[PDB]
Amino acid sequence: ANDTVVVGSIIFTEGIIVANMVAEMIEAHTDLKVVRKLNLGGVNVNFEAIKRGGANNGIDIYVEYTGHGLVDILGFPATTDPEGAYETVKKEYKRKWNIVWLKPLGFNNTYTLTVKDELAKQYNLKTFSDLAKISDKLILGATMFFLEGPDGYPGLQKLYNFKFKHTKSMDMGIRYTAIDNNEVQVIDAWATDGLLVSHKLKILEDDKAFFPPYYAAPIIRQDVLDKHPELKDVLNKLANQISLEEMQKLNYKVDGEGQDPAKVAKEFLKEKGLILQV
Ligand SMILES: CC(=O)OCC[N+](C)(C)C
Numbered sequence: 001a002n003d004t005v006v007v008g009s010i011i012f013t014e015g016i017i018v019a020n021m022v023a024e025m026i027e028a029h030t031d032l033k034v035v036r037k038l039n040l041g042g043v044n045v046n047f048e049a050i051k052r053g054g055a056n057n058g059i060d061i062y063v064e065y066t067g068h069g070l071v072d073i074l075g076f077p078a079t080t081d082p083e084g085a086y087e088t089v090k091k092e093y094k095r096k097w098n099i100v101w102l103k104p105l106g107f108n109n110t111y112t113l114t115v116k117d118e119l120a121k122q123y124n125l126k127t128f129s130d131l132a133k134i135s136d137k138l139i140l141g142a143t144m145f146f147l148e149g150p151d152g153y154p155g156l157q158k159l160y161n162f163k164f165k166h167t168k169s170m171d172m173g174i175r176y177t178a179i180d181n182n183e184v185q186v187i188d189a190w191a192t193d194g195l196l197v198s199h200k201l202k203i204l205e206d207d208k209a210f211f212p213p214y215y216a217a218p219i220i221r222q223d224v225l226d227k228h229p230e231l232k233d234v235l236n237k238l239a240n241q242i243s244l245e246e247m248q249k250l251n252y253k254v255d256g257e258g259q260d261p262a263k264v265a266k267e268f269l270k271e272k273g274l275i276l277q278v
Pocket residue numbers: 010012015043065109110111145190191214
């Protein structure tokens with residue numbers, strides 16, 4: 001039959017690694033072949049693509065974050081525990097879109113606000129509220145995802161009354177260079193970022209609990225499951241197989257050591273026995 005499915009990803013390190021793992025798992029454990037589609041734009045492009053589906057110049061599968069689905073359903077930022085966010089997006093995406101959330105991969109790749117350790121020491125910063133009190137002295141460098149998202153800086157700024165001198169929209173790797181050079185003093189470090197535990201930075205505490213959980217999980221069209229039911233158990237073989245620490249190390253293999261994400265993804269799966277060597 002030569003059936004194929006389309007796995008989509010935004011172009012960023014973690015997204016392409018986990019999309020590749022999904023692709024490798026499908027090709028290793030089923031007869032299906034996988035088109036890897038890369039999307040440019042924000043955290044909405046994959047959602048609109050999966051509504052279209054692989055037969056309609058969209059995608060069939062991608063790895064989504066629970067908190068993004070939660071804020072999209074609610075229309076307002078909220079906080080809840082991981083199960084609250086996961087069960088809510090799973091039930092709602094099935095009802096409204098016939099999209100199936102599979103099990104979480106294991107890590108929570110949340111937004112953070114992060115400063116240099118020395119700045120945190122110079123002002124005894126521990127929390128977002130501590131930072132807000134001195135924010136009028138500081139420049140924020142952040143990803144376009146953070147600056148444009150409803151769950152990002154817009155709602156965060158209003159809750160804490162952040163007063164940064166200005167914000168600079170920056171590519172993901174650039175923002176680490178920028179804080180290192182003191183071009184900015186705060187960045188939206190993401191919890192799994194490969195360069196994070198490598199730059200002498202302090203992650204501050206979200207003391208008012210603005211952000212939702214951001215647990216990554218594969219999601220798939222129901223009609224693709226209807227045609228290839230084996231995909232559910234195959235993709236759920238990834239369930240809880242990637243801790244925060246594991247994801248950070250894979251991200252660093254790409255961003256810090258220059259390895260290509262296809263090789264990084266496949267070697268991880270082989271090392272953990274999730275695929276066998278052919
Ligand atoms: C681009 C993207 O989807 O990144 C997911 C991580 N997060 C929640 C910090 C934005």
